[PDB]
Design a protein around this ligand. Structure first.
Ligand SMILES: NCCCC[C@H](N[C@@H](CCc1ccccc1)C(=O)O)C(=O)N1CCC[C@H]1C(=O)O
Ligand SMILES: [Zn+2]
Length: 598
């Protein structure tokens, strides 16, 4: 019989209902109040009962033996209930503990290091800036310690129950654990291994940047502060989680005498505003013959941090309201080059939303979570080039010297290469818990051992099992899968490469057309490729989505390693010239307490 008419009717209802849920999520995350929190979970609780009642109905349609796979694809997807398979009482408890962590993160406030009276500094503006600009290791340590104790430790109790409920939910859906459930999204039983193999290929490059960065830092801060052969004291890497290091390029760049693209100052001196930044982002898409931002976006978006004393979630993000043209971004944008990249990242999501809007609700998601994260990043790569920045005047006079090209690749290596192992550990960590591989008594050290093992990083001060630091990372507190970023930083270079080729910007043989300098801005053929891929929205496993883009069907590293190659050959030489130590001994930062008072 035909369940097609059923599915059509059902997706349309699910969209209407998710719209209602989305609005409540938006209100809460825009104005954090007990009331909004209540409505928010209330809606989710209702939708969850509807899904259960829709899961039992599908028992009617024996799709597991159907003809036209597309219907059979929708059923497998719709019946795959997530946390919703959970029984009422548990689901409600999960919503709560989830809310407890989320709100806990966003409400973090710490006292200023030079004024124990202020105590109103939050992560997004204040503390985020201190870690970026300060060069007083003791001050950076202060802020690190203060932030981790509030954002991480204070929520160990909820996190643990979250893990328990997450595991219970997974088994109810026939998954081994929440770990395999997340991996299910990549529809490939060998995905983790593929990721393990690509990382293995790039790791050597990662261990020519690490030692080099540890070199300068120790030269700058001094021996007693940064030891050779030991893991780098995170907090001197310009980022609260040390996931990206470009922020300290001023004390760590190859040629400090040569220019270092820092468009922040020009943006500021030029009167740039968040609105202007979003409009630039918008222009990039249309210039590629891609979709212009709809009217609801400008009316309903929050592109600047509210001026009142209300609490909200300001971790940039993009929203699909599941209607037609109702898409919005919420970002506490600031005028800086990094924020400018972020603006493009989020629009990547928005574009993807519009591109697949016409698809059945179930297919209104990205093909593979990684694809959703890579769109915006592909434009950001173009925007970051000296070529495009000179064209828009945010780089008055610049010369491609040669030993200046290194300041661009290496600068990019502090964001794209350094990130890979960081992103991998975020989920390898949560996987090991989801899978009952770690003892509760070793939860906080299992984390740092992993940060140590893969990133060669360690906390600025000694932590014990008494502390619990994983929640200090937004995504851990908000229950947002992280592997998606690791796939993105990999596949985005594949997208970028091809796009640049489809444009007349990249030629492997011709110089003056290097990969690290193509702009693709204004490219209709690149936009066309993007359109073919994006419009499919999960209607097919990701290899077909990629194939729609450039005819390829495999995830690989035939891009980054072809992007950063000149950088990589420059390091191996420079490191030997300065006799730079490569590799590091195991960290001694995780223990189980010690005091000097009695
Ligand atoms: N310093 C601001 C960073 C930009 C914010 C961005 N936000 C995330 C938010 C995802 C999300 C939000 C709400 C519900 C469900 C999912 C994003 O990918 O857009 C992000 O987290 N990103 C962007 C790149 C990497 C990753 C990160 O920083 O770990
Ligand atoms: Zn994103």
């Amino acid at each position: 019989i035909q369940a097609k008419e059923y599915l059509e009717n059902l997706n349309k209802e699910l969209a209407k209902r998710t719209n209602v849920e989305t609005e409540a999520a938006w209100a809460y995350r825009s104005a954090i109040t007990d009331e909004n929190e209540k409505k928010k979970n209330e809606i989710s609780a209702e939708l969850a009962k509807f899904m259960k009642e829709v899961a039992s109905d599908t028992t009617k349609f024996q799709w597991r033996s159907y003809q036209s796979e597309d219907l059979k694809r929708q059923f497998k997807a719709l019946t795959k209930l997530g946390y919703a398979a959970l029984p009422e009482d548990d689901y409600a408890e999960l919503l709560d503990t989830l809310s407890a962590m989320e709100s806990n993160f966003a409400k973090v406030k710490v006292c200023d290091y030079k004024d124990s009276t202020k105590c109103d500094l939050a992560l997004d503006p204040e503390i985020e800036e201190v870690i970026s600009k300060s060069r007083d290791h003791e001050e950076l340590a202060y802020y690190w310690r203060e932030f981790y104790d509030k954002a991480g430790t204070a929520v160990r109790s909820q996190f643990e129950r979250y893990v328990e409920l997450n595991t219970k939910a997974a088994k109810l859906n026939n998954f081994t654990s929440g770990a395999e459930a997340w991996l299910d999204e990549y529809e490939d039983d060998t995905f983790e291994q593929q990721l393990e193999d690509i990382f293995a290929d790039i790791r050597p490059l990662y261990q020519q940047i690490h030692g080099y960065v540890r070199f300068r830092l120790r030269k700058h801060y001094g021996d007693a502060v940064v030891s050779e052969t030991g893991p780098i004291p995170m907090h001197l890497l310009g980022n609260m989680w040390a996931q990206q290091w470009s922020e300290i390029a001023d004390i760590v760049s190859p040629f400090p005498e040569k220019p270092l693209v820092d468009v922040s100052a020009e943006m500021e001196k030029q009167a740039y505003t968040p609105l202007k930044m979003f409009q630039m982002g918008d222009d990039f898409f249309t210039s590629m013959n891609l979709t212009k931002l709809p009217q609801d976006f400008w009316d309903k978006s929050i592109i600047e941090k509210p001026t009142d004393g209300r609490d909200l979630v300001c971790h940039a993000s993009a929203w699909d309201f599941y209607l037609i043209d109702d898409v919005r971004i919420k970002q506490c944008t600031r005028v800086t080059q990094d924020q400018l990249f972020t603006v493009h990242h989020e629009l990547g999501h928005i574009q993807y939303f519009l591109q697949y809007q016409h698809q059945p609700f179930v297919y209104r998601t990205g093909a593979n979570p990684g694809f959703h994260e890579a769109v915006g990043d592909v434009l950001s790569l173009s925007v970051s080039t000296p070529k495009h920045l000179e064209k828009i005047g945010l780089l008055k006079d610049y010369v491609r010297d040669d030993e200046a090209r290194i300041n661009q690749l290496f600068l990019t290596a502090l964001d794209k290469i350094v990130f890979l192992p960081f992103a991998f550990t975020m989920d390898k960590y949560r996987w090991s818990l989801f899978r009952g591989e770690v003892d509760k008594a070793n939860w906080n050290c299992a984390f740092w051992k992993l940060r140590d093992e893969y990133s060669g990083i360690e906390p600025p001060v000694v932590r014990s099992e008494k502390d619990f630091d994983a929640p200090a990372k937004y995504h851990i507190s908000a229950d947002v899968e992280y592997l998606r970023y690791l796939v993105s930083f990999i596949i985005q270079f594949q997208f970028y490469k091809s796009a640049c080729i489809k444009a007349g910007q990249y030629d492997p043989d011709n110089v003056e057309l290097p990969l690290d300098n193509c702009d693709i801005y204004g490219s209709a053929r690149a936009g066309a490729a993007f359109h073919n891929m994006l419009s499919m929205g999960a209607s097919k496993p990701w290899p077909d989505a990629l194939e729609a883009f450039n005819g390829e069907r495999i995830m690989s590293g035939k891009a980054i390693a072809e992007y950063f190659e000149p950088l990589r050959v420059w390091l191996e030489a420079e490191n030997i010239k300065n006799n730079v130590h490569i590799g590091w001994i195991t960290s001694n930062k995780c223990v189980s307490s010690h005091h000097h008072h009695h």
